[PDB]
């Protein structure tokens, strides 16, 4: 970032900015769309100062995330249902543990559902997150129907008077249609107790994931209808610039960001601070 100050504006510096934009996994259709706004913006004001390119980039990137900045409002409904969906191994179950503790912080009663009745010891894994927060977990032995288990967890969340219910699902890849109609099947049985439910369809996306995130958002939204996004494992070298392509194409709001394996390592999404961390020249 600091190396850009002591440089003159030319076609070589624009190529230096494009390569540092692509290395963030932003895309091709998304990177070249911003460069078209920058080359037009450099003639609009006619500025040959290095201080302007860093500012102009933060302005246009911050404009995209301005459309998708709405925070999650779990209050009002009883029980508010949050359906956790995404591909295999993105942080879904761990994110629920982080979420349930930020809602207890807000002063709302939380209950959990063990829906990954396909992966080994997934019930046991969510049960540990329940014990870490001192929250009830409605669960059945792995192999049982996920849709019918979440249905029994809602019937429990209603009767025990719970403010927020976070429902877990299995790791499913968008191309596996049978697993996709299984996700639709979950929501179908949910409407039998509350037509508004699920009140949120939170999609967890790994920061290190590339252009697969495009179809990950597309086919998950086309099937159930996403209303939330959590960009987890962002604590590493992973910038996860692919989120700019997602919001520009589908406009699903980003609710939280995963920055560690601990319960406290979760923050709500902030647009302006996210751009500053994208070009972070730190070791």
């Amino acid at each position: 970032i600091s190396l850009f100050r002591g440089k003159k504006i030319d076609d070589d510096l624009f190529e230096e900015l494009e390569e540092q934009l692509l290395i963030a996994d932003v895309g091709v259709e998304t990177t070249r769309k911003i460069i078209t706004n920058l080359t037009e913006g450099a003639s609009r004001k006619q500025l040959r100062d290095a201080e302007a390119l860093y500012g102009l980039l933060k302005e246009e990137m911050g404009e995209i995330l301005a459309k998708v900045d709405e925070p999650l409002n779990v209050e009002g409904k009883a029980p508010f249902v949050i359906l956790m969906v995404g591909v295999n191994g993105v942080g879904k179950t761990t994110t629920i543990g982080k979420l349930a503790r930020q809602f207890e912080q807000q002063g709302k009663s939380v209950m959990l559902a063990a829906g990954d009745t396909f992966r080994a010891a997934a019930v046991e894994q969510l049960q540990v997150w329940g014990q870490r927060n001192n929250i009830p977990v409605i669960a059945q032995h792995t192999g049982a129907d996920s849709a019918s288990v979440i249905f029994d967890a809602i019937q429990a969340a209603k009767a025990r008077n719970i403010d927020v219910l976070i429902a877990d699902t299995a790791g499913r890849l968008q191309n596996k249609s049978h697993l996709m109609e299984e996700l639709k099947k979950i929501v179908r049985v949910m409407k039998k107790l509350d037509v508004e439910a699920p009140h949120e369809v939170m999609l967890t996306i790994d920061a290190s994931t590339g252009q697969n995130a495009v179809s990950q958002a597309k086919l998950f939204h086309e099937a159930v209808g996403l209303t939330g996004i959590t960009l987890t494992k962002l604590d590493g070298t992973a910038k996860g610039g692919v989120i700019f392509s997602v919001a520009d194409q589908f406009g699903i709001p980003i609710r939280y960001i995963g920055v560690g394996e601990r319960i406290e390592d979760l923050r709500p999404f902030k647009a302006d601070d996210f751009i500053e961390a994208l070009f972070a020249r730190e070791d």
Partner: protein, 413 residues
Amino acid sequence: NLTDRLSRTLRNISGRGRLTEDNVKDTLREVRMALLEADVALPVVREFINRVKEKAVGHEVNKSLTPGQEFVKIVRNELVAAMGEENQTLNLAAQPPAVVLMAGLQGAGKTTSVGKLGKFLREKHKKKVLVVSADVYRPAAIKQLETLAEQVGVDFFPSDVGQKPVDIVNAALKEAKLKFYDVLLVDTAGRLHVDEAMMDEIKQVHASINPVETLFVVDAMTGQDAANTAKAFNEALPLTGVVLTKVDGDARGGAALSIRHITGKPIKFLGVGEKTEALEPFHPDRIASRILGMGDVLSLIEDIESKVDRAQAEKLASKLKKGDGFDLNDFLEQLRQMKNMGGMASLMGKDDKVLVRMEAIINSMTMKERAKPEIIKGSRKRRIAAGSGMQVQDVNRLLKQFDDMQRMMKKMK
């Protein structure tokens, strides 16, 4: 468009000329844009563009096919060899109780692949497998491998969360050698390469137990980040194999070319599902065409080449079979070149009805009958005379004269 049909014919034209940057620069942009969309890192993309350039111009020029399509072959062929120099490099088991260490980032597919590895080495390779977990961080990660071990029918090593990961791997090998287990499959926690703390744990574990196979598990959909990941994980640990997971997905899998380039260690396994059955031995030919994306171009190049290859072989086989020098096809060509002469042999060599009759008999014969006179027999002789309007003796007379001709041809010239 009207200019569209005009511009298409100009490029479709046979480019006999040397493969130079002028034709490349226009179509090289399609390759660079596909590779970036495939999720291949920039240092490997930029180095591979220069790698193709040295081979493209260097005497590799074809007369047929589009100039922007004959360079695609150089991209495709160099992609297969760069990905898999050796096809199916299996885990070494020619030493005492073999140690297989599994390491990668958080949630790559380690414990599942340990389970999928169990079934491979147990059913297909018939070995005494022992599974261990050093993951004392992920909730119920120990119970996860315990169920996976029960699924395949492989013996599992007990562990606690209170137990130190360095002591688990040390005591694991102790029980492995005692019961003479063929392979010791070691599963470790999710580790971020940035973290100095746990990256020192895996290094200490790699030292504690000498792993004959250090398999680096990485997700198939991982983007540009794979550059930072492959560098640090090879610079810290001496890797011997890569395990690519979630390959069943619609993701191009650009990281696979990114991992093989930076580490230089060959990919050994491919995961094609959540199930235990979902393990395939590495093959680059399949994954190379999946990273490229453009299959409609390669489908025609391999279809046009085959059309040319079959035509070049068929037109040469007929010439090699007719290379004997003489047959009735050559004899008929001699008659017409003689009849064309306005003076005739009758007036030159000091009988006319014989030559006119001889042309009709060979004319009634098939292509096979002309090439080989020996196949003409009983019913074959009766067919020639019926259509020619001659006799069985006329055909037999003609064949005798031809037999003495080839005897005279082979003896002289």
